[PDB]
Write a protein that binds this DNA or RNA. Structure first.
Ligand SMILES: [Mg+2]
Ligand SMILES: [Zn+2]
Ligand SMILES: [Zn+2]
Lengths: 83, 99, 1335
DNA sequence: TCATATTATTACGCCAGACAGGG
DNA sequence: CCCTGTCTGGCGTCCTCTCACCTATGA
RNA sequence: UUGAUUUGGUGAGAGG
């Protein structure tokens, strides 16, 4: 559940970047393909995003690392499927 | 009273006003200043582009909501292009510059 | 997608390139059928087909050949919205000059062709002729010609001679006007003249002459040749309910211009005579000028009935144009509105929202959910399901609500706490249930209020509603540090009845093993809620580094304090509940909980406070009766003693012993004294009326009277309201402004009779009229403030400076009003504060001063802190993060991005409603004396008299801080001296303001220099005393033969030689001013401190006159340069004053209006920032004389005095940043090696980055001068014309921007609210960082 | 029905900004 | 020629709800 | 491809 986002503001200390990081993550869960890193208590993708932020496993650096890993996986998939 | 989507005016692309006309709430000037007072840049962007005026934005948004994709494709408000044609209908050459 | 918006003039080639066809015929439509007109205003070929992909007449009724245009239709083939973007053009037969460039004040064609507006209009309305390159005749180029002047010239210069009229002639003049040539001439003219007026008249003409050459704007583009017509879709022709078409006003305007243009083409075909085509072209000129901006010419045209019809400029300007009505504020889908109600079961992050509104606002989410499950197929099926409202869509609705916030909004939103985001809880009902604490943020009572709900659609908006705008996140008001979720009215009564005590109850003095059995003894019926009792409580004090240490003890407390201790979180001490808990105490309870335990315990503890307050206020049964308002038994004898006193005064009035004004003053004084005595009688009779015994004799206590707990708790009520319900209700005042001598001796529990209620209605009708007219000025003040701010975004982290204003505590002359901890709380210091002992680094030089630092400042008794202010920030285009300060609603520093101009403007203008609209020095405390700005001398008796007017008398305590301050005049009798210790209440100063002392420095004999009785001075021997005095005349009463004679007194020795000033070689002569009377006559030896002559003599519009920076009517005059001073010419309009500096150059002077009582003598040396007369002082003089920090201290003190007189807490950051936005423009003094001009006004960030990129080179920079513009002149003088056009007058700003060819690099908040994109402040600051990086 | 085209009331209160007048 | 009355323009609060009323002419 | 007119504008009154 969710009442305040205060710990998520503590771990991403800008309070304006929290919205952007959790929005990037909640778009990775909504359309999205991806599955959450945290157990869901029938919370929506907003609260699951912020709840991932509070326990310190999603920030901007982890999302860019995962997207570089997916870009390398697509690169290796294209190279190993064609050649 | 409540409004999700219905009819609008003629001159402008914004929703009608009142209850006898099935219309939405005027999100006035001081509410825009109150959203600027927070960091509500995306809430204000859908509050004056998708929810109100931009016709391509609101049809894409209704289809995006009912597909299950909360995402806005904003575009430019229609009443600002109405402003451009009313200013341009003077002897004034107002434009929109480089990419 | 696109950068800046460019505005320029419209060439006739550009207007033909916009166009799609010439609009000929004025015929609108057929009107008997449905078809339009071919080819009239609403054409087919010129614009497009009414129907989508259809020839209106007949061909193409499918989707194959989109474009073909047959001869039978003369129609394009595209979309229904294609006509909204397409515009037509009217080939104006006769040229017509634009009204926006002919009447803009100043006119664009008025200061360009060097011709007066009057003469320009004469020729323009076919009433005067104008010459154009005549030839070899005796006539100028600008000189005009009349009928008689032309007739004679016609017969004279019949050959080479040109003299046309109207726009045609004007056009030629502009067309044949070598811009470049004029530049040099004008520039050379400005450098070959000294005329002040001319200089300004030449610099304003050359500025608009070189600006036209810088852009691609031609001089012949001012006159309209190819008038453009607005798209039909934008001038819609819809019928109302009936059979007629309600036509727009622009169709009347365009149809008249086309009717007249067709008539003028036909008359130029037929070769009508001169006067016919002059009237025809003049009617076309007036028709075009009425189309563009109606009513700027003489009385505006009208269709139905006498009301004028609305033109294009009236579609732009005004409160109902496009900016203020459709681009800044829009009507909004997914929105709702209903009446609010309480619902106190809520947690403060959630609100109640009805099921009917919830099913209407969330129709697309329900459609998406229904389509996901598989219950239905097509969208229609889902719309039938929710139109029928079956049994399965309510589970769908509870599954779309759950974690989806909504924006509740009360309709007059003044500050940012009036839009807050909640989570819905569904309501059987039709009313929004709103959590009560949150009401004190919205200013929402429940007397019929309404609120709007808005739905954040996208995912970033749901996250902004949860992470920025959630109601748990707004628990501190952004104007200050005070909590805004303070418990308002019922809950403080429940607490004040709960945590209190009485001297005997059930369970007096029994001992309890915990708070749990305290509540168990209250519930079972064995003790009372207020019964004093030793309990054993375990308070957790967190004295280690983040570790909570338990200490358990026995507190002598009550039952209610233990029950309320069951709700307090762990870290707070027990002494927060040990007192009686009114409203100030519960506010600081929540404030100490927020400062210690953070946010989440403070949210859950605010809810538990509200729940236990409501529950024990329900258990209290705290009614109000007729017996609760206890009448004083002493009230009738007080009224009879006052009646005996007015009887004595009127018996003196019958015998004429006293005056009438002294009678009125004595009656108002005794009724004020009797009113205070009646209030003290009732206040004793309410505050300690209960007297109950305990085990023996009686003992008194504070009362449990109901109206007294409603007053003492601070729930609702004060001293004045409870005074008017029991004691007499004062002396009400008539609308003349003066008070009424017969008061209203009857309260409300006794009956008012008729006259007393009528006087009461005077006093209350004035208050209702004041609020209902005050609110307009309060709202317009908030508008001007958020449009001068509008741009200022926290955009750095350190500006890298060492300058900042000097925060001292403010002291008016009473006790120290606002302590230093209120002013330097959460503001980052400029240099490191020295500890008051000696040279210690107490705090470092860039530390935020939160509460722990401010307590270590209060322990050391720190004098004053040099702290960083927003007006000293060195950041180009924004404010750095340290020079702002603390976040104010967040504990930390301001984040990179958060818009501080808008929250500051709202925080100053939001209390605009609460504000109103319409001898010697006696010490109070006991301390040490200190003097500043002092040059003094010891008199003969010993009292240190002062030879300086501007001396500040401070009372410093034994610790080092400054506790008192006063202003002591020139020549006062100080009972004390420098550095001395006094007693509390001892008089330390004395003077006579009705007698300006002309006291000396040295001793000697007195001579009358230039003092001749008969012309200079006069003989007026005193009547009632006999001790005469030679009365000095002024320079106006004596005649012109002796008017040049200046009477004076110069002190000599026993021989006659001039005793010199100690320090110089100049004698001490004192020139006597006008209206003086000589006290000490000739031959009398003098000393210091003895006179040489007798010289006899605000609420809200104050806030407006400080921010708008008006001048007062009689300003205090100052000196622009230091040095010696003297007088001048005898009364030619004014009386001169010449200042010659000691080392600096002489030629500055000023002609003082001689109606002022001056301060300076002839032998006085002045300084910049030193006063010459007295009264109010304009801020421009502060800015150009003392400094920037002086004017920002002047505005923040002169407006915190209004906000403190009415009792509103606002931090000074907001006034410092609106002061920054006032003085943002500057003027050049020395142009230097840059590209500027001499007296050009340029904005400060521009000139600073210019000479900071030139000074980093070898070249030395440009030296500016700052100027203070008032807020509406400063927001209309911006480098962004949309920012200055969404605000006041759009005509002036759009013509200035058009003829300058101005460009709007958007870069602010309101340009991006207009153009429809992300704000460059909040969440969008990362987006604008990205876009500014990727260029 | 289908072109023809504009006249006999006053009663705000500052507050800047530009303009002819005169010592 | 620098003060100066005098005249002309340009402001004047947001949100909402109910009702009625809408150019004359004319061979 | 499955449907339609107030906003426009005035005046008066009301709510917070
Ligand atoms: Mg109310
Ligand atoms: Zn066709
Ligand atoms: Zn700074």
């Amino acid at each position: 559940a969710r009442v305040t986002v205060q710990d998520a503001v503590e771990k991403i200390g800008n309070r304006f970047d929290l919205v952007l990081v959790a929005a990037r993550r909640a778009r990775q869960m909504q359309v999205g393909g991806k599955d959450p890193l945290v157990p869901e208590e029938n919370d929506k993708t907003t609260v699951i995003a912020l709840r991932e932020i509070e326990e310190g496993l999603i920030n901007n650096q982890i999302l860019d690392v995962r997207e570089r890993q997916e870009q390398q996986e697509q690169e290796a998939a294209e190279l190993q499927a064609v050649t | 009273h409540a409004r999700s989507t219905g009819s609008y005016s003629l001159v402008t692309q914004q929703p009608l006003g009142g209850k006898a006309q099935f219309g939405g709430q005027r999100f006035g000037e001081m509410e825009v200043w109150a959203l600027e007072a927070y960091g509500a840049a995306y809430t204000l962007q859908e509050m004056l582009t998708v929810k109100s005026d931009d016709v391509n934005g609101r049809t894409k948004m209704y289809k995006n909501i009912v597909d299950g994709n909360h995402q806005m494709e904003p575009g430019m408000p229609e009443s600002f292009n109405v402003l451009l044609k009313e200013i341009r209908s003077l002897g004034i050459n107002i434009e929109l510059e480089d990419e | 997608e696109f950068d800046a918006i460019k505005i320029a003039l419209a060439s006739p080639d550009m207007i033909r390139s916009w166009s799609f066809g010439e609009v000929k015929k004025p015929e609108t439509i057929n009107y008997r059928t449905f078809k339009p007109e071919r080819d009239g205003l609403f054409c087919a070929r010129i614009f497009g087909p009414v129907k989508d992909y259809e020839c209106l007449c007949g061909k193409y009724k499918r989707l194959k050949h989109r474009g073909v245009i047959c001869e039978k239709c003369g129609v394009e083939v595209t979309q229904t919205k294609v006509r909204r973007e397409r515009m037509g053009h009217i080939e104006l037969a006769s040229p017509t000059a634009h009204i926006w460039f002919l009447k803009s004040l100043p006119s664009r064609i008025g200061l360009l062709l060097d011709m007066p507006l009057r003469d320009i209009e004469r020729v323009l309305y076919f009433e005067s002729y104008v010459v154009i390159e005549g030839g070899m005749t005796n006539l100028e180029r600008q000189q005009i010609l009349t009928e008689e002047q032309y007739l004679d010239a016609l017969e004279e210069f019949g050959d080479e001679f040109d003299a046309k009229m109207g726009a045609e002639a004007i056009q030629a003049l502009l067309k044949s006007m070598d811009l470049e040539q004029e530049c040099e001439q004008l520039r050379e003219e400005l450098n070959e003249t000294n005329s002040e007026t001319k200089r300004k008249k030449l610099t304003k003409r050359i500025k608009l002459l070189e600006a036209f050459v810088q852009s691609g704007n031609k001089p012949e583009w001012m006159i309209l040749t190819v008038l453009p017509v607005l798209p039909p879709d934008l001038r819609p022709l819809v019928p109302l309910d009936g059979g007629r078409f309600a036509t727009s006003d622009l169709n009347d305007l365009y149809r008249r211009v086309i009717n007249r243009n067709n008539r003028l083409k036909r008359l130029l075909d037929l070769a009508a005579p001169d006067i016919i085509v002059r009237n025809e072209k003049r009617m076309l000129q007036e028709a075009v000028d009425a189309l563009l901006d109606n009513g700027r010419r003489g009385r505006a045209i009208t269709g139905s009935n006498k009301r004028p019809l609305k033109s294009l400029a009236d579609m732009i300007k005004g409160k109902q144009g496009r900016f203020r009505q459709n681009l800044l504020g829009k009507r909004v889908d997914y929105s709702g509105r209903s009446v609010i109600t309480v619902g106190p079961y809520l947690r403060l992050h959630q609100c109640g929202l009805p099921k009917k509104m919830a099913l209407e606002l969330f129709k697309p989410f329900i459609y998406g959910k229904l389509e996901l499950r598989g219950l239905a197929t097509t969208i229609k099926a889902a719309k039938k399901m929710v139109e029928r409202e079956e049994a399965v869509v309510w589970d769908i609705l509870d599954e779309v609500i759950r974690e989806h916030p909504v924006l509740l909004n009360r309709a007059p939103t003044l500050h940012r706490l009036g839009i807050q985001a909640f989570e819905p809880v569904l309501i059987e009902g039709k009313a929004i249930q709103l959590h009560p604490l949150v009401c004190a943020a919205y200013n929402a009572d429940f007397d019929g209020d309404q609120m709007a709900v808005h739905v954040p659609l996208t995912l970033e908006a749901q996250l902004e509603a949860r992470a920025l705008m959630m109601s748990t996140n707004n628990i501190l008001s952004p104007a200050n540090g005070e909590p805004i979720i303070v418990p308002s009215q019922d809950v403080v009564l429940g607490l004040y009845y709960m945590t209190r005590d009485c001297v005997n109850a059930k369970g007096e003095g029994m001992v309890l093993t915990g708070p749990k059995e305290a509540e168990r003894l209250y519930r079972s019926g064995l003790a009372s809620l207020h019964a004093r009792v030793k309990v054993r409580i375990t308070e957790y004090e967190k004295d280690a580094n983040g570790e909570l240490v338990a200490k358990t003890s026995l507190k002598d407390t009550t039952v209610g304090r233990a029950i309320l201790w069951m709700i307090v979180p762990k870290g707070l001490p027990y002494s927060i509940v040990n007192q009686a808990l009114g409203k100030k105490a519960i506010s600081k309870m929540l404030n100490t909980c927020y400062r210690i335990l953070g946010l989440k315990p403070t949210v859950i503890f605010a809810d538990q406070i509200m729940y236990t307050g409501f529950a024990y206020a329900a258990r209290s049964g705290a009614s109000v009766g007729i017996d609760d308002m206890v009448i004083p038994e002493k009230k009738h004898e007080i009224i009879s003693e006052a009646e005996a006193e007015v009887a004595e005064i009127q018996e003196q009035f019958q015998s004429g012993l006293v005056t009438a004004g002294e009678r009125y003053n004595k009656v108002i004084d005794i009724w004020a004294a009797a009113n205070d005595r009646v209030s003290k009688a009732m206040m004793d009779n309410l505050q300690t009326e209960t007297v109950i015994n305990r085990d023996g004799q009686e003992e008194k206590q504070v009362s449990f009277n109901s109206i007294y707990m409603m007053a003492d708790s601070g729930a609702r009520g004060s001293a004045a309201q409870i005074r008017q319900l029991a004691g007499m209700r004062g002396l009400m005042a008539k609308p003349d402004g003066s008070i009424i001598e017969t008061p209203i001796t009857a309260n409300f529990r006794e009956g008012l009779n008729v006259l007393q209620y009528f006087i009461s209605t005077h006093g209350a009708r004035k208050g209702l009229a004041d609020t209902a007219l005050k609110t307009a000025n309060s709202g317009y003040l908030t508008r001007r403030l958020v449009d001068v701010a509008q741009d200022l975004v926290v955009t750095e982290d350190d500006c890298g400076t060492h300058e900042g204003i000097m925060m001292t505590p403010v002291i008016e002359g009473g006790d120290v009003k606002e302590p230093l901890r209120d002013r330097v709380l959460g503001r980052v210091t400029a240099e490191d504060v020295l500890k008051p002992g000696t040279a210690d680094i107490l705090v470092p030089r860039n530390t935020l001063l939160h509460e722990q630092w401010c307590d270590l400042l209060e322990e050391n008794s720190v004098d004053a802190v040099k702290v960083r202010s927003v007006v000293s920030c060195d950041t180009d285009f924004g404010v750095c993060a340290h020079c702002y300060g603390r976040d104010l609603a967040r504990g930390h520093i301001i984040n990179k991005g958060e818009a501080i101009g808008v929250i500051a403007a709202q925080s100053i203008g939001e209390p605009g409603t609460q504000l109103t609209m319409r001898s010697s020095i006696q010490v109070k405390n006991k301390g040490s004396i200190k003097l500043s700005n002092v040059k003094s001398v010891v008199n003969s008796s010993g009292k240190l008299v002062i030879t300086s007017r501007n001396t500040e008398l401070k009372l410093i305590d034994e610790f080092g801080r400054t506790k008192e301050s006063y202003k002591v005049p020139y020549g006062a009798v100080l009972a004390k001296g420098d550095g001395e210790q006094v007693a509390g209440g001892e008089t330390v100063a004395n003077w006579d303001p009705h007698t300006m002392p002309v006291i000396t420095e040295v001793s000697g004999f007195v001579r009358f220099t230039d003092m001749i009785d008969g012309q200079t001075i006069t003989r007026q021997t005193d009547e009632l005393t006999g001790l005469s005095s030679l009365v000095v005349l002024d320079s106006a009463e004596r005649t012109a033969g002796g008017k040049d004679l200046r009477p004076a007194l110069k002190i000599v020795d026993a021989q006659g030689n001039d005793v010199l000033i100690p320090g110089t070689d100049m004698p001490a002569q004192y020139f006597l001013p006008g209206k003086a009377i000589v006290q000490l006559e000739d031959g009398v030896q003098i000393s210091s401190g003895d006179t040489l002559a007798r010289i006899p003599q605000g609420g809200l519009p104050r806030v407006a006159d400080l921010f708008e920076a008006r001048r007062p009517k009689e300003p205090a005059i100052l000196a622009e340069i230091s040095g010696i001073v003297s007088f001048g010419k005898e009364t030619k309009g004014k009386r001169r004053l010449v200042i010659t500096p000691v080392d600096g150059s002489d030629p500055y002077e000023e002609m003082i209006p001689k109606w002022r009582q001056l301060n300076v003598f002839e032998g006085e040396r002045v300084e910049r920032g030193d006063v010459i007369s007295d009264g109010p002082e304009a801020p421009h003089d502060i800015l150009r004389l003392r400094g920037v920090h002086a004017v920002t201290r002047y505005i923040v003190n002169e407006v915190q005095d209004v906000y403190r007189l009415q009792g509103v807490k606002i931090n000074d950051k907001h006034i410092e940043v609106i002061v920054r936005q006032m003085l943002r423009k500057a003027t050049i003094v020395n142009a230097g090696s840059s590209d500027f001009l001499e007296g050009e006004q340029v904005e400060y960030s521009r000139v600073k980055i210019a000479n900071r990129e030139l000074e980093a080179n070898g070249k030395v920079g440009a030296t500016y001068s700052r100027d203070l513009l008032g807020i509406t002149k400063a927001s209309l003088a911006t480098e962004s014309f949309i920012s200055a056009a969404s605000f006041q007058e759009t005509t002036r700003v759009l013509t200035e921007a058009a003829v300058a060819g101005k460009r709007d690099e958007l870069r602010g908040l309101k340009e991006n609210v207009i153009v429809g994109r992300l704000i460059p402040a909040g969440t969008g600051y990362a987006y604008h960082q990205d876009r500014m990086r990727r260029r």
